[PDB]
Amino acid sequence: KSTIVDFNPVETSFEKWAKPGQFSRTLAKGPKTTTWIWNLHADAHDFDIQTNSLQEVSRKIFSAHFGQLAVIFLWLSGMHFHGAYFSNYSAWLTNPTSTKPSAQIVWPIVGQEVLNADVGGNFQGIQITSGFFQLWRAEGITSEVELYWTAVGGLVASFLMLFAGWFHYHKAAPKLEWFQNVESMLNHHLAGLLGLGSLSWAGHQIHIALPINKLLDLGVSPEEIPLPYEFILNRDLIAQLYPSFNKGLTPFFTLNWGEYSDFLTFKGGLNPVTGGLWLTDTAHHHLAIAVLFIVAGHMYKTNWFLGHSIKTILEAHKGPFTGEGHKGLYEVLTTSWHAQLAINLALFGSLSIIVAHHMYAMPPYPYIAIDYPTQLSLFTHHVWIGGFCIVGGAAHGAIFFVRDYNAANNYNNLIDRVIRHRDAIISHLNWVCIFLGCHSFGLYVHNDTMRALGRSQDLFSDNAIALKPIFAQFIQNLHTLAPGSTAPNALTTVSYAFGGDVISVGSKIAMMPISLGTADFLVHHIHAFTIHVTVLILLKGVLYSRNSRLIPDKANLGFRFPCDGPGRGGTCQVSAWDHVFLGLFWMYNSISIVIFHFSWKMQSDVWGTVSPTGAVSHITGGNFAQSSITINGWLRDFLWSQAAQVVQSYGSSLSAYGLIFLGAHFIWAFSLMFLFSGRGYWQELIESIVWAHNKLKVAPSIQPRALSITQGRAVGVAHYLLGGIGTTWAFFLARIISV
């Protein structure tokens, strides 16, 4: 009878496994039409409509989190197992600059063995662009046995998380008060999870990754490198590489932290041997992060007369312009899972995009900057994940507004005041979007039409009307001057992208000053415009989710509904879901432009080879500066030019990329059937098909119905995203692996 958990709440039985749709009150009666099948999967994780108790929803969410973490652990275990058994990691360790990472071999069936490429190191397989080899090298993993043991540990951890989910749904489910301890949860997630994870990783780096990687960079082969445990039992194997361990932990406890400058450095730049960040800098960074997060975890009052109450902090932040201020926000975020999901997903996607930027900007792994496929894939993948997560955060904000928003509890607070002037916000955001689009894109079109008319001096180019990004160049200058002036204890700039020397590893450029000209001005304003339009769609969905001048009772129709009818001139897509659908489209557009800008700019003005005398030759040859300012330039010098490797991949080991290119084109075009058409035509065609089936006595008892309007839109957008992202995926991968 614990005060935090309920014991044996749900019986572990297979009876409900044999009753599909048991969770829903409407679906439990059984299918009558094929719409029931689709409704079954669309409501599976909508725990809000399955129970009327916040406690049950919270417990379901907790167990679902455990299942998701078990799935993630299984995926990581699979990655490590493939590295251990079906990879050339050992060969890549001895030749990182000449062996391509491969960790998946393809069975010899139907002639598909051509996919096993010549990745080097007496190996055949698919080249890997996830950068696991570089990460494992940075971890100090020098043998495939360690990868096997990490895979075994991942399997054990996945089983543990599965057992935890089962235990906390069926044997000991926490109570609502336990879930609502946001102060305790924040304290623990900030100190324990974040800070202690940073501290543990700093310890691992210092004791395992720092010596092993230093020996690897010194040229010591992985076979004669001591086993990682020997660096702990023997204080002399690590005190030779870093002659500060001879003093032990006495400098730490005597506040003489200057003695540890051997392995806790602040250098900046990149390791000249590997092209990645100095691992001493990384260990010092993780140590500082650990201390900062542990300190930050002692902020909120949990069980003693010590710390802050988030309710008292929010309620004190009022103002003349904001009425009641943040009063009621604590009740909103402690009684609505959707609001928490909105905030967490938005910040999580933004964090993913920031991670993507800082990855290539400052390569943190050895021999990852010179693996161009890995860098391109990591950036594009993380930016895509960030965009998807941001759209999801907007969607769940809209869901909270529709479902969990209480008008009485939010009288004259920030949420109320935002809804009260939603018109002004949306109208000014509309004006900003029109201004930004007009300018950015019409400058592009003006360049295109001036070039087409033979007026080269009328373009918005560097040798013409020039739009120099002076503000960004000022920041670039400030960073390259930071070491010794504003960061006096730095030896080198944080990233060579801001300026400095060309860093090359094995005649391949790792990082180099990224010059910003009029071409970068236009593409940056294109980014701003696309982001603003996506924000416009999502914010219009969130703010007008409850009511509008069209439908004053839109909240009574729910978050997900197709329309209110053909009246009022037509009320299609007025939902808030139909705004997360359009916003998904515009996020695809924005992220596609972002990754295109990254790919072309890097290939044209960063990546390449360096001659022995110091001459820099890039992959494309600097065509970004003069040919990325017109749409015809993007079509020809980027799309047409770099699509050569994809279309000429047939018969080679990259033929799978051409096949996926074609299939993604097919899927993207397939999406337009659902996006352009309507439900009535398909229902009436199914009518004649059903007539034929009845004529042959083969009409199913479950009456076949065309997909609902909302499901038609969902299928269309899912296929559109899959096709477009897969086309860009195949194009990028084939292009950056070939060259």
Partner: protein
């Protein structure tokens, strides 16, 4: 011969294709070492390529000017193994599938909960019906004769 094509056994371009593929595979084989699994895999590829080309040559297959086997599907039994025999095989298999599906639909359509037995299959009855589809050509021309294959006017029609 038929349509201006020639047998692949006497098509020079066919042998040129075989030689070029084998040469590419051997050049790939040259860059690996000893009896290592990559060399074994490439050698197996070479052997399979040679076997496939030899089988296509000795298969009554007509090759065009590009040295690729062309299919003669006008209906003549001479090239009957290209389309006609696979056509019969597919017709048998697909008729089996359709017959067992229709029989299952009509069988569980006379129970208390026909819709339940469509998402949750009666595996015993399903297995009973599925292995009975080998007589689908005979069953179809024994149910059509009895009038049990086609509905007449209980089928629904739209307004016009």
């Amino acid at each position: 011969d038929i349509g201006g094509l020639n047998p692949c056994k006497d098509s020079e371009v066919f042998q040129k294709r075989l030689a070029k593929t084998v040469k590419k595979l051997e050049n790939r084989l040259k860059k690996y070492e000893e009896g290592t699994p990559p060399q074994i895999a490439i050698q197996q590829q070479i052997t399979q390529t040679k076997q496939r080309f030899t089988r296509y040559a000795d298969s009554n297959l007509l090759c065009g000017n590009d040295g690729l086997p062309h299919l003669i599907t006008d209906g003549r039994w001479s090239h009957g193994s290209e389309f006609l025999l696979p056509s019969i095989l597919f017709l048998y298999i697909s008729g089996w599938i359709g017959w067992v599906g229709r029989k299952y639909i009509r069988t569980v359509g006379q129970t208390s909960n026909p819709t339940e037995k469509e998402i949750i299959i009666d595996v015993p009855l399903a297995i009973s019906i599925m292995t009975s589809g080998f007589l689908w050509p005979f069953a179809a021309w024994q149910e059509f004769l009895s009038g049990d294959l086609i509905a007449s006017d209980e089928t629904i029609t739209t307004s016009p």
